[PDB]
Amino acid sequence: GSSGSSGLLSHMDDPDIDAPISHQTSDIDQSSVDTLLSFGFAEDVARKALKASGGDIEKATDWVFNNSGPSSG
């Protein structure tokens, strides 16, 4: 549960204009998974919800409820 940001200098195109390698990690933003971590969910489910929802927290927050199981072994 944390995040930050800062810096400005004509940045309109990509956060990294020098890396011919498909962005790492699924579309599921890491910051998002955390956004749910604070809410009150397991990072795992945070990704599962953001996996079906797709970043959309409001959807992820629901996904958790919509579907989910006890414990995770």
Curated annotation (Swiss-Prot):
<comment type="function">
    <text>Recognizes and hydrolyzes the peptide bond at the C-terminal Gly of ubiquitin. Involved in the processing of poly-ubiquitin precursors as well as that of ubiquitinated proteins. Involved in seed and embryo development.</text>
</comment>
<comment type="similarity">
    <text>Belongs to the peptidase C19 family.</text>
</comment>
<feature type="domain" description="UBA 2">
    <location>
        <begin position="27"/>
        <end position="67"/>
    </location>
</feature>
<protein>
    <recommendedName>
        <fullName>Ubiquitin carboxyl-terminal hydrolase 14</fullName>
    </recommendedName>
</protein>
